[PDB]
From a paper:
Herein, we report the specificity, substrate scope and activity of a set of plant borneol‐type dehydrogenases, with special emphasis on the highly stable and active borneol dehydrogenase SrBDH1 from S. rosmarinus. The overall architecture of SrBDH1 in crystallo is tetrameric, in agreement with SEC/MALS measurements confirming a tetrameric state in solution. As a member of the superfamily of short‐chain dehydrogenases/reductases (SDR), SrBDH1 folds into the characteristic Rossmann‐like fold, that harbors the cofactor NAD+, and has an additional short α‐helix at the C‐terminus.
Binding of NAD+ leads to a defined folded loop region from residue V197 to S203. The apo structure of SrBDH1 lacks electron density for NAD+, and the latter loop region is not defined. The remaining apo structure is practically indistinguishable from the structure of the binary complex.
Residue numbers in the entry:
A (entry chain C): 8 to 266
B (entry chain B): 9 to 193, 206 to 266
C (entry chain A): 8 to 192, 208 to 266
D (entry chain D): 8 to 194, 205 to 265
Write the structure that this text describes.
């Protein structure tokens, strides 16, 4: 359909949002290369999807590995059209007294430095092609505070600013750099049959502002499909939230005055 | 796609409104062209065919807006998409070029037209616990210098409306988002010379597919978002680079 | 005394935030023109404060009245340094079904069109002076939804876009255009407010405006300075559900 | 004398904006503890100003040193009222092809991780006192892109997010956390570019200007200001003058 004959690299594409983006991009004609370090999940997936889907282990904290993944993909299919820097690790809401200098630098390496390096080499191969699309995974905590840890928030804020400066610089060559800032999708925490899904799906019905629909990974996948489609040929520098209006309301006032 | 949905497009006789209308017809929904260019509007709504009706509606008349909505809800069964596109534009100007009579008139067309479309779309959508309201703002919401003072302030108010609307209509499962395009309203040579994302020209069909996305079940969880279509123009002040590297 | 020899016009300056800013500007040397439509309160204040404080009735929805207010201030003192478009009417959180087209247009006139006109005639006299300072009153609802009505929200959003596009235009002459977006116009305030231990009074919004209008802000322009104690930066629904 | 009887710590306080805030805080009563790694400048300054101003070497990349700097101040004075995370290194506009993983990580350490540790240990002593104030040095590139490099841009954006969630968390105890995002660039031909690039014409952005903005942000005058990224840009980040300039 929308991605017939396009080539995509999806870091973290073996689990959660990346896996759904990978399945979706496959469904729309794209030549996709799963990139992750969960090698069983990743390689099994790229073989389950099949002919147009490859896998490539890549630690985003090692530039040699990153440069290798892009150049391998360039050699297999001909070029890179979509670069989805999804790989990251999360941190729930916490205190600054729970920030460990070690855990902090590790979190930053995976989230932000992985984003820089993934972008740097995506740009390196895209500039000569004068065509392309780069999409970062930030989070809703970029527009509101209180749904993520301090280091995780700070890492995703930097991801947003990087995406911005990328749109300016990389615009000169006609390739776009956008974000997506989804919410808490039911893929990160451990699954256990139907009890966990229904209870967590009920709490999302509680906390979310837009009630009646629940955020799946496929939902974030189609947002990225649009953001990566040529239907967005003039969208760049945009941090498109998929939050149902959570980051635009502090209902403390209404709820206190309704008691 | 949009099969079996209902669309109301204020300003659907010219440009962006007409392109979104042709798109919604092009696959799926039943569209109700609403504008005051009745020749253009009726010509289009007849060229398109069965699923496309027309209805004169001056957005400054709450009774006319109420009538258009209620006629469509009675004709098809309900209203799924409300596209508050109708408006008048004004390029960059001075505060001294604002005429209070022009000011209030433009404010009437842009901001009050959105308000009334919002109120009566909400009136018919809330009981269905469904709906989609999509405002046409402008790129001047994130940067200033591409629109006049009355225009920017009118679109800033549209955003605050959309925000507070999404919070309120969230309780019922209804989404309220904006789209803030750039310049579709020689012309294309200057547009290239200014745009940040070079190579691609911003047409009305571009916003049409953007609005289709925002209204699609593919956006089941997008609400409170002012989705710019600017190619990164509103996120850069190229003065520093242009002065120190020219 | 940070306002020695300056001239300020404070629309809505007879009640609340305007009255607090006006007493403050008096406290720092400034010659102030209280502008409102509550003529009793305004002249009482302008007589109690003393020589450097005058009054001028001005319905901001009447351009002739505002143009008169500007020129009266220019003729009385020599010029205008500060134009504080504070006058406005409030509307608490409500529904879209409670928006009345006539009541809507009234709030817009006072809030947005009053601000437009106050700016236009402040600009008219400030451009030739090659200096100036303009401060609008928005509200914390500029950054969050759920603490104000739909019409008030949209009017204050429009005020912000006005202030922004104005700071761009009036920069060429050395003129600044800023906003202030406070929270409290209480035990309830203690409960809702994010920054605990203190409370937003009118004097706080007044001293924020004093800074914004001082030379302490010589290069501050285009800013919508929130005074919310971090209310507009947190949606605690998630954490509050999971803590019990 | 607004800061009468207050105690302030300024990391990077031996040079520039930190130095301007330090003398300003001295002028307004406050007891200041200069923290930097240019030990010559800092001690020269801290003895220049006099009895209420001391100096303390502190590499913010060393959690042990920052913990010592905070505890030294509490041991000297009793507590910490103001913490100004000013220390950082700059990067002008660049390309992503000029990004070195070793340099990037170093800049990230000094700018963002130093902020985390300085904030963490300021909080360590401020929470029990149920009072305090944390102020970061960001930059004008937080609201516009085109006056800083990608590594600086991302580091100051992250500095903003830290301040936001910190203000959310530390509000419960009566502590405020704000940022200031000056126009770091502009601080004969220097004057020609000042006339050219700046939006608000007619005024020059000095370090003392940013110093006085921080004085307000740290003063009682901001008793209810928290979570705010107060830009000092003269409206630079609110206009893309390309459109008007092309049509002229």
């Amino acid at each position: 359909r929308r991605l017939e004959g396009k080539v995509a690299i999806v870091t973290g594409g073996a689990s959660g949002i990346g896996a759904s983006t990978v399945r979706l991009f496959h469904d729309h004609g794209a030549k996709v290369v799963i990139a992750d370090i969960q090698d069983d999940l990743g390689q099994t997936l790229a073989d389950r999807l099949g002919r147009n889907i490859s896998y490539t282990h890549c630690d985003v904290t090692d530039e040699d590995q990153v440069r290798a993944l892009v150049d391998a993909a360039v050699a297999k299919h001909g070029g890179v059209d979509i670069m989805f820097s999804n790989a990251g690790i999360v941190e729930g809401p916490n205190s600054i007294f729970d920030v460990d200098k070690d855990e902090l630098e590790r979190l930053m390496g995976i989230n932000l430095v992985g984003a820089f390096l993934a972008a740097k080499h995506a740009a390196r191969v895209m500039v000569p092609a004068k065509k392309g699309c780069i999409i970062f995974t930030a989070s809703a905590c970029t527009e509101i505070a209180g749904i993520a840890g301090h280091s995780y928030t700070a890492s995703k804020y930097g991801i947003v600013g990087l995406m911005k400066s990328l749109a300016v610089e990389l615009g000169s060559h006609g390739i776009r750099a956008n974000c997506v800032s989804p919410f808490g999708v039911l893929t990160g925490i451990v699954p256990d049959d139907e009890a966990s899904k229904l209870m967590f799906e009920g709490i999302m019905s509680k906390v979310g502002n837009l009630k009646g629909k629940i955020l799946t990974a496929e939902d974030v996948a189609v947002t990225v499909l649009y953001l990566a489609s040529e239907e967005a040929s003039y969208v760049s520098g945009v941090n498109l939230l998929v939050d149902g209006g959570y980051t635009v309301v502090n209902p403390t006032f209404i709820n206190v005055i309704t008691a």
